[PDB]
Design a protein around this ligand. Structure first.
Ligand code: 1N7
Ligand code: 1N7
Ligand code: ZN
Lengths: 1341, 72, 282
């Protein structure tokens, strides 16, 4: 059940699993986040409404001067997108707010209002989001990478080991809020427990308990369990709770009933506790020595005196037992301490507690928060209440409360805003229990502690900071507040908020240039998480902790796609099915499980909600109904993974792909690659430059179509219909009768984007693929972009590789590319460089853009027209002129004998200095397009007038073609008027269309309908008169250029770089390479049938770097081209549709269980010929990533062709014509072309420009300056005895500004001497030391 | 050499040293002990027969392992 | 990660003392951590030797040995398998191709069923355990003292056997015989070499060649005392007694021989032995 578009070539699809969650729209992060940002949102939640409800209303100094909020608006831009890339504006959208300045009357708190002046005030231009989540800030398409930062809540950290040298670990616990004072708990190595408010001094941690209305009795009964001792007529009985005695010294005879069930000295093993439980002991009679070290909880005083016998939390010695014996107590309370489990911590910290009771504790808090402030009753009350208990001065965000209740094993995920007695006490219990053995510590990386921002929330915060810095000014201008003379816009300033928001979108560690050199690059750049930036941890502070992968990445961030090198792991790329949760933490799909069934309901899980479940594994064969095939299946429960019984799973992975990203899920046979290698593979697939004829992955992974379509490059049909008029520019879809709106149907039209620059200087082209008179279904591609083909992402080209050494040309990783790959121009990649030539305004005068140039005859000026700009199309080369420009330079200041010379030949020395924009030395191109911006203070020249006329012709053509469709829709609606009630069918197609307004009709509601539709027609008329007026006026106006520039002339060269020894190349699995000798055809190897193997890689790179996936891909490719050549023979020897059907059907079934059966008996006889003609280059093959095609499937798919099952053909060398012993592997591997081109990298500099502060080399153009002869190189030269080369390496070649010119004079005059002198850098050092008062001089002898 | 080759060497180093630590722990050589090195209880047959020459009863082992779980 | 040749005269002593009287009366050592103390007649220690496991002895507590009686013996590679209980023997689970193999010594004349390891056996005796089970005269296993747990001796692979079935056994009888530093080698070990950082516990080394004794007793640091041939004697130095001495009260040591142990810091060697010595250390 396929469409008519999908049948262009139906990708053979292995992969055994059924997909149950189709791939989400890959750009959900950017789009949905910026959608939450900018929208009138009738609820106080996120969006701009959040910021405005936060900072407004502004009340003055209580003076009945208020400025409140009403509602805002997003006026449409003045320049739309492509206009805004041409000209250079920020694709903004002017903001508007309805602020409402109210002024209450004095002698009135809320008495009668005296003025409510309601006026709408401008502020800022928020740069809107394109349809592809890519803003346009200054002409270039920029992208704001999602950030990943610590969620405000609670954290229990270790800081294990190194401190204190005893090895003993500390267990600190931090309560970070959204906004307010922190709170920390920590152990000392002496094991007492201490607190600290915001990172200030430590404190005896019981002081905060006491400050919260806790005296020692209830402290000890919160942080401890009770053991009562009894004095029942003889010597110190004890309560026996049976499980109190696991792992403890038996320092006494544990008898019972006068029977000995446990004996002294031993240890109470589980046997003993078992037997005491079975033998029912409850009150054991132990000696006094065992109470001698116990601790007494409650307070005891002589009941006859009221004098304090034992304070709370004192150790009972024998004397105190005696003393309270004579007071009439048979109950005694003792803390159940223990070295293992119920440790003494709060008790011994009370030992450390200097203070005694509540008021003293509040005093100490007041003296630790701020010194010098004398303590006080109410000062202490206010300070302590306002640390953690002030709704104004402290608020966990609701995210804060949610983490704080999920990390305590609480109940409600949402609740209060400030802390409480119970929140603090639960923190402390959790802390002590962490240290007691039960419980564990949340390591940093755990994605339950990495809330994900994105464009929306970050821009919201920047607008927030803007609002605070402006409400300062608002309250200030309200200080002087005249009641009714300042409207609600002189209080504000617009440029503040615009400054903040532009600073974010244009200067950030996030808002960065789109890696727009390959559709996979954009859609793997917009899906991106970053841990750097403002508010995240940067490298120095942190640090190795967050580089790591952590088992909560399984389906939430890709593990095998992260930028290797300087910052690994800080650029985690988001998974395939991942999402941002409601609160923010990354979440992912999982299929629900009933009693024992695998439901098809996908259910989302965040990070903190997972471990309490037990998730199955997607690689589980299930039994045609939703029951597993076994009773025990692999699963993963809490980090660990293991076998579980069938009746225990709760969640199955949505699909085998979800562990990866869109980066590494395109690598076919990813499953057989060492993870570093898939890392480098994805990170070299993000850089493939779009070739000239982008072919297709001959072996793909299923996700490639979704990446091509969901990225913006393909030209996706908005509505299904017939194709009326294709063309290299535009595609005209005639919408069908059912997908067609009721009024003014019309037809959809797509203006493609022909040749044009992207940021990385490549060609972002679009070519139609659906030809004239041809159906298209909704949601289908019309026009392939760069590196797409038929809507299947084709980054590089497939080609014939043969693994074999072949004379050292591929030594380390080098590659040997036969000239059949470069003759065809199949890696010939097109690069569209932009050269600008401004025309500035110096003190001497304005630069000219004349065609009149000195010291260059007609020679270099043959390509220039009458005005100094080159023609569109002249094939400039290295060193020619594109824009003739001359600057007036007075004071020629003639010299000696040069003056004699001018006398000798009378040649008038000109007043003008040539500065024309000449092509960079080396490129060789075609000037595809010249644009001339002009300050509107200059008379536009002749060529700019040509350009204005031409663009205006174009825009007139376009907008008139638009008006035609529109009026056709309105005539349609007119017929829809007549069709009901008195339509005259054939009396309306004969006569002219324009004379339908005067068509007869009875004066019912339908005559008034005709009148109304005539009104609509004339409105459209005047509308497009005035709209073409506005188009002509946008074109005709001057530009608004930088300060002091007359006119800029942009010239778009279009180089075509082919391929040449040095151009890096690479497969997908991470086999790099540097194509190293572009061999003839004859020389290459050739299999017994004749075909020369185009590339020749190296065998020594498959075992050493375990990326055997490239050998399996090579074999699947060889089988694929086997099928291809079989269809080619069946089609060239032209057979029929019948043989083709039987053979393609044999290819598409092919054995093992698959989810792809197509049944070509429904393809019409003429579709299968088209299907063949698209397969005649070779049958594509899918292979979902961790669910690929196992080897034996490949072997049978080879045997379906006629290749040898071994995969290894016997090759004959091309030069000697004699068989390679030991057959080689040959196949069709898909190889990219990385854009580390050679001619971008090559560089050489003999005498260029120079610096200005130190006479060193400095060039610009391609760092047109010498290589850095750094320090380690100087160590090298000193290691050799060579010292002359060093002396000239930093005296003659580099700095000594007489040494270098004398060296050049000597070199030209054929005397290789050198006259060093002394470096100008050291002379600067003498001056910089001497400006300080340090007289450094050089002795002279 | 490449940047993944060096990472392979480091991964070999890391897992080899970890595994060889944990094989250094387990004894596999008899020194028949017959009752604890701390508590004195008899070590049962099954435990002394799995791990030959193990000085400590089961409970003493769990207890020392738990005091060491907080890393000394 | 091959016997104690006593040299001097004096009484004998053991600390951490534990051993068993073998059938030959030799008070053969079962304990590991016992140490032998060669005492002079003063009542103070002369020399010390850390007891080998299952070593052979002749002398005992508080008795004079003279220089030359090699009392403390130990088989240099073999790990003795002595047994304290008194009884007879049977062999259970020692089967050809399964746990042991048929192994005949031709130089002794008796066969030794040297226990075969986890890689030398097949599925017929894979999980099986070579068990030397002690018995009484009845054929019942002699209980070991202090357990309701019989006496059957476990033998890992590679263990050469002393005697076969039918052999009576008693204490101090090795049934079996099994054969017999942290060199942090990163780069940061090399940086910390050239930086010459003083280690954690400096291997305490002498000052001068001369006789010794012990002085002021542990006001924190117990004090060593060093007096020359005849010269500048007054040096007596603090020493954390929290780590062992490898010296005795009456030794005339050469300067530059370890009193204690540990990675000796380089400053010590340079000031004590000579520059050649320290450069060879590094
Ligand atoms: C009247 C008709 C209404 C829809 C039926 C109008 C609306 C837009 C018109 C087409 C567009 O201009 C594009 C194209 C331009 C070519 O150059 C000339 C042919 C094309 C096919 C035009 C024919 C026709 O005139 C169209 C369909
Ligand atoms: C990783 C490193 C190669 C990188 C160059 C190789 C080369 C030498 C190897 C160690 C030494 O052999 C000593 C020791 C041997 C033990 O038996 C098992 C572990 C030890 C620590 C080994 C760890 C690791 O395997 C080393 C560092
Ligand atoms: Zn024990």
């Amino acid at each position: 059940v396929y469409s008519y578009t999908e049948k262009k070539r139906i990708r053979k699809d292995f992969g055994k699993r059924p997909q149950v969650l189709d791939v989400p729209y890959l750009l959900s992060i950017q789009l949905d986040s910026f959608q939450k940002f900018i929208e009138q949102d009738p609820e106080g939640q996120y969006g701009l409404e959040a910021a405005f409800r936060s900072v407004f209303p502004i009340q003055s100094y209580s003076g009945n001067s208020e400025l409140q909020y009403v509602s805002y608006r997003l006026g449409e831009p003045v320049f739309d997108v492509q206009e805004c890339q041409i000209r250079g504006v920020t694709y903004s959208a002017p903001l508007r707010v309805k602020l409402r300045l109210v002024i209450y009357e004095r002698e009135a708190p809320e008495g009668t209002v005296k003025d409510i002046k309601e006026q709408e005030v401008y502020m800022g231009e928020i740069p809107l989001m394109t349809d592809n989540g890519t803003f346009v800030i200054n002409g270039t398409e920029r992208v704001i990478v999602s950030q990943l930062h610590r969620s405000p809540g609670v954290f229990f950290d270790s800081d294990k080991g190194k401190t204190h040298s005893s090895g003993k670990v500390l267990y600190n616990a931090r309560i970070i809020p959204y906004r307010g004072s922190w709170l920390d708990f920590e152990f000392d190595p002496k094991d007492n427990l201490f607190v600290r408010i915001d990172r200030r001094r430590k404190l005896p941690a019981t002081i905060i308990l006491r400050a919260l209305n806790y005296t020692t009795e209830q402290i000890l009964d919160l942080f401890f369990e009770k053991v009562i001792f009894e004095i029942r007529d003889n010597k110190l009985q004890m309560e026996l709770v049976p499980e109190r005695l696991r792992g403890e010294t038996a320092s006494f005879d544990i008898e019972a009933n006068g029977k000995v069930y446990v004996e002294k000295g031993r240890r109470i093993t589980a046997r003993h506790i078992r037997q005491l439980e079975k033998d029912d002991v409850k009150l054991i009679e132990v000696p006094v020595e065992y109470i001698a070290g116990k601790v007494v909880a409650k307070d005891y005083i002589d009941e006859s005196t009221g004098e304090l016998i034992c304070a709370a939390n004192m150790e009972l010695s024998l004397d105190l037992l005696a003393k309270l014996s004579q007071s009439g107590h048979k109950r005694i309370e003792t803390l159940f301490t223990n070295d293992l489990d119920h440790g003494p911590y709060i008790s011994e910290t009370l030992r450390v507690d200097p203070t005694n009771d509540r008021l003293s504790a509040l005093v100490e808090i007041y003296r630790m928060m701020r010194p010098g402030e004398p303590p006080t009753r109410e000062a202490a009350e206010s300070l302590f209440e306002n640390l953690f208990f002030s709704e104004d001065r402290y608020d966990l965000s609701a995210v804060g409360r949610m983490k704080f209740n999920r990390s305590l094993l609480r109940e409600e995920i949402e609740g209060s805003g400030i802390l409480s007695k119970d929140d603090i006490i639960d923190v402390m219990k959790k802390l002590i229990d962490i240290r007691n053995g039960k419980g564990e510590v949340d390591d940093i990386d755990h994605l339950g502690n990495r809330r994900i921002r994105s464009v929306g929330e970050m821009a919201e915060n920047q607008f927030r900071v803007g609002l605070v810095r402006v409400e300062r000014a608002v309250k200030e201008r309200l200080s002087l507040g005249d009641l009714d003379t300042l409207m609600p816009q002189d209080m504000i300033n617009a440029k503040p908020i615009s400054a903040a928001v532009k600073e974010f979108f244009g200067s950030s560690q996030l808002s960065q240039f789109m890696d727009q050199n390959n559709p996979l690059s954009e859609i793997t750049h917009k899906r991106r998480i970053s841990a750097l930036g403002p508010g995240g941890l940067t490298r120095e502070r942190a640090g190795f902790e967050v580089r790591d992968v952590h088992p909560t990445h399984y389906g939430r961030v890709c593990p095998i796609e992260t930028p290797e090198g300087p910052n690994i792991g800080l650029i985690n790329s988001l998974s395939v099915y991942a999402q941002t949760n409601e609160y923010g933490f990354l979440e992912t799909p999982y299929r629900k499980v009933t009693d024992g069934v695998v439901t098809d309901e996908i259910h989302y899980l965040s990070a903190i909600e997972e471990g309490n479940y037990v998730i199955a594994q997607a690689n589980s064969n299930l039994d045609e109904e939703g029951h597993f095939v076994e009773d025990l299946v692999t699963c993963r429960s809490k980090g660990e993974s293991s076998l579980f019984s069938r009746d225990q799973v709760d969640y199955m992975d949505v699909s085998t792909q979800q562990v990866v990203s869109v980066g590494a899920s395109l690598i076919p046979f990813l499953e057989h690659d060492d993870a570093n290698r898939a890392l480098m593979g994805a990170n070299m697939q993000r850089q493939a430059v779009p070739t000239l004829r982008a072919d297709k992955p001959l072996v793909g992974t299923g996700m490639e179509r979704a990446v091509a379509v969901d990225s913006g490059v393909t030209a996706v049909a908005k509505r299904g219909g017939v194709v009326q008029y294709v063309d290299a520019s535009r595609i005209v879809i005639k919408v069908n009768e059912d997908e067609m709106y009721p009024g003014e149907a019309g037809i959809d039209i797509y203006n493609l984007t022909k040749y044009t620059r992207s940021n990385q200087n490549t060609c972002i082209n679009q070519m139609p693929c659906v030809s004239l008179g041809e159906p298209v279904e909704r949601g289908d591609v019309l026009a392939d972009g760069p590196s797409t083909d038929l809507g299947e992402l084709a980054l590089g080209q497939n080609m014939r590789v043969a693994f074999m050494p072949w004379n050292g040309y591929n030594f380390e990783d080098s590659i040997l590319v036969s000239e059949r790959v470069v003759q065809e121009d199949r890696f010939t990649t097109i690069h569209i460089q932009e050269l600008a030539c401004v025309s500035r305004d110096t003190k001497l005068g304005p630069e000219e853009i004349t065609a009149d140039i000195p010291n260059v005859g007609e020679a270099a000026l043959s390509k220039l027209d009458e005005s100094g700009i080159v023609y569109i199309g002249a094939e400039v080369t290295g060193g020619d002129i594109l824009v003739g420009k001359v600057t007036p330079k007075g004071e020629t200041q003639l010299t000696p004998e040069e003056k004699l010379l001018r006398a000798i030949f009378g040649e008038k020395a000109s007043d003008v200095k040539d500065s024309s924009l000449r092509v960079p030395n080396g490129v060789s191109g075609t000037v595809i397009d010249v644009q001339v911006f002009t300050r509107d203070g200059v008379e536009k020249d002749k060529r700019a007038l040509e350009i204005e006329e031409m663009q205006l012709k174009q825009a007139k053509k376009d907008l008139s073609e638009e008006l035609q469709i529109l009026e056709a829709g309105l005539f349609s609606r007119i017929r829809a008027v007549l069709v009901a009630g008195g339509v005259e069918a054939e009396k309306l197609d004969k006569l002219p269309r324009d004379r339908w307004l005067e068509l007869g009709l009875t004066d019912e509601e339908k005559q008034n309908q005709l009148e109304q539709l005539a009104e609509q027609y004339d409105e459209l008329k005047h509308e497009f008169e005035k709209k073409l007026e506005a188009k002509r006026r946008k074109i005709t106006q001057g530009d608004d250029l930088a300060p002091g520039v007359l006119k800029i002339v942009k010239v778009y060269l279009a180089v075509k770089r082919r391929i040449q020894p040095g151009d890096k190349m690479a497969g997908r699995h991470g086999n790099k390479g540097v194509i190293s000798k572009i061999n003839p055809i004859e020389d290459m190897p050739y299999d017994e049938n004749g075909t020369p193997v185009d590339i020749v890689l190296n065998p020594l790179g498959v075992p050493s770097r375990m990326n055997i996936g490239q050998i399996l891909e090579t074999h699947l490719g060889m089988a694929a081209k086997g099928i291809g050549d079989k269809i080619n023979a069946m089609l060239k020897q032209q057979q029929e549709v019948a043989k083709l059907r039987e053979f393609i059907q044999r290819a598409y079934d092919l054995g093992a269980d698959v989810r792809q059966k197509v049944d070509l008996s429904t393809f019409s006889d003429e579709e299968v010929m088209r299907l063949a003609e698209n397969l005649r280059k070779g049958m594509p093959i899918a292979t979902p990533v961790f669910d690929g095609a196992k080897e034996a499937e490949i072997k049978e798919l080879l045997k379906l062709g006629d290749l040898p099952t071994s995969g290894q053909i016997r090759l004959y060398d091309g030069r000697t014509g004699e068989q390679f012993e030991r057959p080689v592997t040959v196949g069709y591997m898909y190889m990219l072309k990385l854009n580390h081109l050679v001619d971008d990298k090559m560089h050489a500099r003999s005498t260029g420009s120079y610096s200005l502060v130190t006479q060193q080399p400095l060039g610009g153009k391609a760092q047109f300056g010498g290589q850095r002869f750094g320090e380690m190189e100087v160590w090298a030269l000193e290691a050799y005895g060579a010292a002359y080369t060093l002396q000239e390496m930093l005296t003659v070649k580099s700095d000594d500004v007489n040494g270098r010119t004398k060296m050049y004079k000597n070199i030209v005059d054929g005397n290789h001497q050198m006259e060093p002198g002394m470096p100008e850098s050291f002379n600067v050092l003498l001056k910089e030391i001497r400006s300080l008062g340090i007289n450094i001089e050089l002795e002279d002898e | 050499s490449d940047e993944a080759d060096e990472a392979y060497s480091v991964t070999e180093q890391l897992t080899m040293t970890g595994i060889n630590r944990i094989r250094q722990k387990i004894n596999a050589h008899g020194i028949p002990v017959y009752l604890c090195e701390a508590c004195g209880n008899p070590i049962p047959e099954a435990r002394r027969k799995i791990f030959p020459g193990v000085t400590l009863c089961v409970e003493c082992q769990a207890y020392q392992e738990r005091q060491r779980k907080h890393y000394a | 990660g091959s016997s104690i040749q006593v040299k001097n005269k004096g009484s004998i002593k053991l600390s951490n003392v534990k051993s068993v009287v073998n059938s030959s009366g030799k008070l053969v050592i079962t304990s590991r951590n016992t140490e032998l103390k060669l005492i002079d007649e003063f009542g103070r220690t002369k020399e010390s030797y850390k007891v080998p496991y299952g070593a052979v002895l002749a002398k005992g507590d508080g008795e004079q040995v003279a220089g030359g009686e090699t009392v403390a013996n130990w088989d240099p590679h073999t790990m003795p398998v002595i047994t304290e209980v008194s009884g007879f023997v049977r062999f259970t689970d020692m089967i050809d191709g399964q746990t042991i193999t048929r192994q005949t010594d031709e130089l002794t004349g008796l066969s030794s069923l040297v226990v075969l390891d986890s890689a030398e056996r097949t599925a017929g005796g894979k999980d099986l355990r070579p068990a030397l089970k002690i018995v009484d005269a009845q054929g019942n296993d002699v209980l070991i003292p202090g357990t309701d747990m019989p006496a059957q001796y476990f033998l890992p692979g590679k263990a050469i056997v002393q005697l076969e079935d039918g052999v009576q056994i008693s204490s101090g009888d090795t049934l079996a015989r099994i054969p017999q530093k942290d060199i942090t080698g990163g780069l940061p070990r090399v940086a910390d070499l050239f930086e010459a950082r003083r280690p954690k516990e400096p291997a305490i080394l002498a000052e001068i060649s001369g006789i010794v004794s012990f002085g002021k007793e542990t006001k924190g640091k117990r004090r060593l005392v060093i007096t020359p041939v005849d010269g500048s004697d007054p040096y007596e130095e603090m020493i954390p007694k929290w780590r062992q001495l490898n010296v005795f009260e009456g030794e005339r040591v050469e300067r530059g021989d370890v009193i204690s142990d540990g990675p000796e810091a380089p400053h010590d060697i340079l000031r004590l032995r000579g520059v050649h010595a320290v450069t060879r250390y590094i």
